[PDB]
Design a protein around this nucleic acid. Structure first.
Lengths: 148, 187, 55, 348, 106, 236
RNA sequence: GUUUGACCUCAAAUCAGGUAGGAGUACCCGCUGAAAAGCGGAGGAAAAGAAACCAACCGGGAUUGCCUUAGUAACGGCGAGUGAAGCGGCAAAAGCUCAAAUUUGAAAUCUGGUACGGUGCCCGAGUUGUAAUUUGGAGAGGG
């Protein structure tokens, strides 16, 4: 599958091609708001290994944050904005000297596709509501420093 | 509007700044007639729609219905292939006697490797222009890639000659200008 | 090749016993620069299921 | 507020203006100044939703054709629901006598279209339906043989018939090739055509069942090849009012090739007599002969008559146009060719 | 194998009768179309038109009626001399009159 | 305009095709007319009849003067007409497509049918069809022309156009008289053409016609005949 | 072809269906924080949880809580005093799911609408990947 090639092309970020894509996409997002929706993940490999599935009930938001942690705060922004959505996880996509750009994956527990497909029904439970608020996300656990 | 302004501002700065030579391999694409005959070739190898699939399925299920049913063995189907990871999968075998790569993909990094991959593998790849038209010939909105492996004898000579043609028009013409930095002129 | 511009001469290479093609011919244009342009847009001209080569 | 602008009404309904015109004709809604309450009645109608989904169907058809996939478009065409007019026919004319009263206009338009030639706008299927249904109704008239009033004219042939005792005025312009006017727009008459076609179709259903015979009237294909008219249809099973019905009983005619066959054979069928045209004889299989001795009357409009059989009576067709108007026999001496004719003023 | 399993699913469904064969479905449609379409529940004497006299006023002021407006002309050129049975001019006006009547209704 | 390098190849090969087939027809008809049958395909000719895969029945030609009505069908996909067929069509006035005319069928008329076979369709009409055609279609040369010939026609003895139907069906007295009197004829196009719903009908009648019309290019081609009662039911 | 149509993107809905707030807050989880207060978020528990672990043994084997380890190790103007952890006994015990190579001999996946949780039909979503199978304890292909 092609997603490997995405992974190892992403591995070389400061290379000419990906720095060019960084520098065009940073500007293009700069024209856009602080928070807004993306039609598709710009790093689909990262989204999958963080748990993305391309079907109804998976929402992509691009969040802009000024330079707690920046990733956690960015997650909290969409947490307040999209209360109905539940924050799954986020990842880094782009940055600027003025702002850092992150892509967050949110899941709707109301769409029957998520409510069915018992692989993901677990997020429908009320106990998972606002994981980012309680630091239960990946960055939340990392900042809390919970490991063995 | 905001987004009309953005999209009109998009494609200006990209040409304003120097695009990397891995890009601008795109938009140095197949000429008019050659794309036209490529699509005429493909339109014989449209994949079966979900609707046609279901019609043949109910037909054959009804054929099994009879007492006095009928049992037969049928040959392989023939069609283009179009899914991205599947397209790369038919590469590294190799099985793709042809691959078409759309130029306009918003995550271009999904496709930047495909030209070099098929170059080194020797698959006769071509950069088609417009993912939507690939979608039209494949019962999809968009495809971004179109690989073909198996071809009937009635088109095999056409396939080989088109392969030589694309080798003449794309690999020869644009390899030296695939080989330079594009853009960089202000707008 | 008139549409590219007026041509001084045109010929095709021909067989004697029966009127069938040897599939290659010669042209001649009034202006060399026009001749360059016609060659450039035609050197790999896919047509009728096979490619044409002009030099 | 009693008056609503046409743009306002059509945008509130979210419809095309031409289809708004269709609906206004279709439900008999009359006024860019229309009643608010009638339009409120026009908010909810299944036919409106069916028109909108036909719009979406057309869009999806454009989608398919642009994609080049033909079989799917075939599926959509075959698996297509068709909007029917029947409901507002019944809830516009619940009382059958009111439908009988209002069929007067409905007959006229369809007869005109049965005359009308085929055009790019007017499909040949529409005209086929028109002529078929018109011949069906003419055969129905011929069955009970109850018409009383006859007219000849440059402007049509106005015949007025009682049905269920209600007297109904129809016409048939003569079968001549008409020059099509570019001034008119068929988008109105086609809607009127469909509405009247369905109206009169169901009216004929009730009339045929009331008369007690099979509604779809069978026709012999070769007999149709002899002539495309009411006589083509054979009317199955599952007294006449005197004098006009059963007028000229046991009476047999010889209509000529010179005479207009259509209206005269209709009149004779209303009289119940037999119709024999040599125009039919020259193609009908075998025959080509006067196989009936009973024949003793000719309808013909010619100065010179060749065989001049004394036993056979020779009459110009105005005679038939007169007796039925009088309901009684008159001398044929004025009607013998080439005698000049009285000015016949019909009784209206 | 999976297409075969789907085929056999359809087979068991038709065996139970949950799915009608397409040929039988077309038969039902052909019958049902017929079945559905089956079941349901004075100026002419002022006008001359057969060798009569009155229209001898028609050619006398023909220029005059021509000089009127169109909406006068159509009714004013309804009346024209009827020669004999042989000739009927051919209904140049009738279609226009029916179209105007349809608009008057609308 | 820059036309193309491709349509030229199609029309050139299609002309080589039309020229070879019409040449073969000329050989065969010249040898038959001169009665020099030593090495040819067949000695007598045949008539095909398609009716409702669909049943196709063939008959031997009868040297009998038979009424027909020609309907011109759109020529093959990429052909410019050869001059021989052009002259025949101009004589029969079949230019301006969707144009028909009534014709007498005798042995002298017969060989031209193979000449114009890939541009027309034949069949046996009924009086109901003919009557519908004339009473719903048909015009005559402009202005006094239309009147004066009606006088000459009266000298021949015809009146009350229904008798033109009677004589065209009968052929007893004078067909070429009435034939020249109906010099122009016109039919609508069965499909309005451009439009979402319409294009389906264009494609469907393209397939249906491809099923019906057959291009032998043999010079022994049986005369293809169709039920004109259905063709005019569509076109009138 | 100045036409028309494929997409992409964006708006607008008195369009259909849902969802967030607020109170309380004994316990729990994050942010902030002085000489605790405050903020944010639930639930009946919560958190954590199946080793990038602990150990140096004759090795143990998710997490959680109690006794012990122990007022020891370590820290500290090594002053005030601060202050663990392995292991062991006990309670209770539970293991699983992705993302990486193709089904390409047929997106096999699913929301919604509609006629009778299910079934049919139709819109759609989806190949820029929904299904099946495989989470290293292997697993896959076949015979």
């Amino acid at each position: 599958g092609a997603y490997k090639y995405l992974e190892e092309l992403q591995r070389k970020k400061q290379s000419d091609v990906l720095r060019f894509l960084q520098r065009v996409r940073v500007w293009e997002y700069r024209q856009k708001n602080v928070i807004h929706r993306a039609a598709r993940p710009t790093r689909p490999d990262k989204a999958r290994r963080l748990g993305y599935k391309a079907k109804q009930g998976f929402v992509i938001y691009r969040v802009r944050v000024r330079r707690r942690s920046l990733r956690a705060t960015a997650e909290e922004r969409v947490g307040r904005r999209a209360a109905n959505l539940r924050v799954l996880n986020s990842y880094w996509v782009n940055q600027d000297s003025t702002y850092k750009y992150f892509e967050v994956i949110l899941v709707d527990p109301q769409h029957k596709a998520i409510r069915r497909d018992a692989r993901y029904n677990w997020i429908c439970d009320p106990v998972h509501k606002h994981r980012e608020a309680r630091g239960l996300t990946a960055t939340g656990k990392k900042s809390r420093g919970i490991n063995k | 509007p905001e987004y009309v302004r953005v999209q009109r501002q998009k494609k200006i700065l990209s040409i304003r700044l120097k695009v990397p030579p891995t890009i601008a391999q795109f938009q140095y694409t197949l000429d008019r007639n050659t794309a036209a005959e490529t699509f005429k070739l493909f339109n014989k190898y449209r994949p079966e729609t979900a609707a046609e699939k279901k019609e043949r399925l109910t037909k054959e299920a009804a054929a099994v219905a009879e007492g006095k049913s009928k049992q037969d063995a049928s040959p392989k189907p023939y069609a283009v292939k179009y899914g991205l990871n599947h397209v790369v999968a038919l590469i590294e075998n190799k099985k793709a006697k042809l691959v078409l790569i759309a130029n306009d993909v918003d995550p271009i990094e999904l496709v930047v490797f495909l030209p070099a991959l098929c170059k080194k593998m020797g698959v006769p790849y071509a950069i088609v222009k417009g993912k939507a038209r690939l979608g039209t010939l494949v019962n999809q909105k968009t495809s971004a890639v179109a690989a073909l492996t198996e071809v009937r004898a009635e088109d095999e000579a056409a396939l080989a000659k088109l392969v030589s043609t694309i080798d003449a028009n794309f690999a020869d013409k644009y390899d030296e200008v695939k080989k330079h930095w594009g853009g960089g002129i202000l707008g | 090749f008139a549409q590219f511009g007026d041509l001084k001469e045109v010929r095709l290479a021909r067989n004697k016993k029966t009127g069938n093609s040897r599939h290659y011919g010669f042209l001649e244009f009034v202006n060399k620069e026009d001749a360059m342009i016609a060659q450039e847009s035609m050197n790999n001209y896919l047509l009728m299921g096979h490619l044409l080569q002009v030099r | 507020r009693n008056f609503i602008t046409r743009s306002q009404a059509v945008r509130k309904l979210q419809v095309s203006l031409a289809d708004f015109r269709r609906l206004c004709i279709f439900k008999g809604i009359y006024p860019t100044f229309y009643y608010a309450k009638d339009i409120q009645y026009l908010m909810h109608e299944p036919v409106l939703a069916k028109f909108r989904e036909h719009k979406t169907f057309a869009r999806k058809l454009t989608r398919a054709l642009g994609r080049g996939e033909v079989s799917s478009a075939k599926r959509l065409e075959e698996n297509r629901d068709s909007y029917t007019l029947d409901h507002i026919i019944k809830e516009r004319y619940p009382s059958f006598p009111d439908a009988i009263r209002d069929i007067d206009d409905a007959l006229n338009m369809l007869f005109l279209f049965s005359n009308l030639p085929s055009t790019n706008q007017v499909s040949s299927k529409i005209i086929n339906d028109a002529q078929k249904i018109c011949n069906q109704w003419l055969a129905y008239v011929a069955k009970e043989r109850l018409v009383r009033k006859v007219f000849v004219s440059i402007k049509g042939v106005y015949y007025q018939a009682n049905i269920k005792g209600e007297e109904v005025r129809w016409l048939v312009p003569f079968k001549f090739p008409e020059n099509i006017p570019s001034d008119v727009d068929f988008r109105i008459m086609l809607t009127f055509l469909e509405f009247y076609s369905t109206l009169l179709h169901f009216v004929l259903y009730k009339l045929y069942t009331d008369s007690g015979l099979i509604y779809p009237p069978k026709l012999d294909l070769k007999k149709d090849k002899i002539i495309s008219g009411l006589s083509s249809y054979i009317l199955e099973s599952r007294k006449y009012d005197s004098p006009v019905a059963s007028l000229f009983s046991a009476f047999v005619f010889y209509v000529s090739r010179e005479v207009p066959i259509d209206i005269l054979e209709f009149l004779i069928l209303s009289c119940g007599g037999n119709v024999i045209s040599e125009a039919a004889m020259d193609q009908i299989e075998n025959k080509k002969d006067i196989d009936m001795s009973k024949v003793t009357h000719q309808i013909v409009d010619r100065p010179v008559l060749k065989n001049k059989v004394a036993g056979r009576t020779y009459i110009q067709p105005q005679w038939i146009f007169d007796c039925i108007n009088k309901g009684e026999l008159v001398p044929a001496n004025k009607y013998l060719p080439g005698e000049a004719l009285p000015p016949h003023l019909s009784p209206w | 194998k999976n297409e075969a399993k789907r085929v056999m699913k359809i087979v068991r469904a038709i065996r139970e009768g949950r799915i009608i064969p397409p040929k039988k479905l077309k038969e039902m449609k052909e019958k049902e179309k017929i079945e559905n379409y089956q079941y349901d529940l004075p100026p002419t004497n002022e006008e001359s038109y057969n060798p009569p006299e009155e229209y001898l006023l028609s050619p006398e002021e023909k220029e005059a009626w021509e000089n009127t407006e169109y909406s006068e002309r159509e009714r004013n050129f309804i009346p024209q001399k009827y020669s004999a049975l042989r000739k009927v001019p051919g209904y140049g006006e009738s279609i226009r009159e029916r179209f105007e009547r349809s608009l008057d209704l609308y | 305009k820059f036309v193309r390098a491709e349509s030229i190849v199609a029309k050139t090969l299609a002309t080589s095709r039309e020229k070879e087939r019409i040449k073969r027809v000329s050989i065969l008809e010249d040898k038959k007319a001169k009665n020099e049958t030593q090495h040819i395909a067949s000695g007598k000719d045949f008539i095909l009849k398609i009716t409702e895969g669909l049943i196709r029945e063939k008959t031997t030609y009868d040297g009998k003067p038979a009424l027909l009505f020609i309907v011109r069908v759109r020529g093959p996909l990429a052909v410019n007409i050869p001059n021989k067929a052009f002259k025949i069509l101009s004589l029969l006035r079949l230019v301006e497509t969707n144009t028909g005319v009534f014709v007498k069928l005798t042995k002298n008329v017969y060989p031209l049918l193979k000449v114009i076979a890939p541009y027309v369709v034949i069949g046996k009409p009924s009086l109901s069809s003919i009557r519908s055609l004339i009473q719903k279609r048909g015009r005559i040369i402009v202005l006094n022309d239309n009147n004066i010939v009606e006088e000459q026609l009266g000298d021949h003895g015809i009146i009350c156009v229904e008798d033109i139907i009677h004589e065209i069906a009968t052929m007893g007295e004078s067909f070429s008289v009435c034939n020249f009197f109906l010099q122009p004829f016109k039919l609508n196009r069965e499909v309005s053409g451009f439009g979402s719903l319409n294009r389906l009908r264009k494609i469907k009648q393209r397939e249906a016609e491809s099923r019906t019309r057959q291009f032998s290019n043999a010079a022994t081609a049986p005369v293809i005949e169709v039920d004109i009662d259905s063709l005019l039911a569509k076109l009138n």
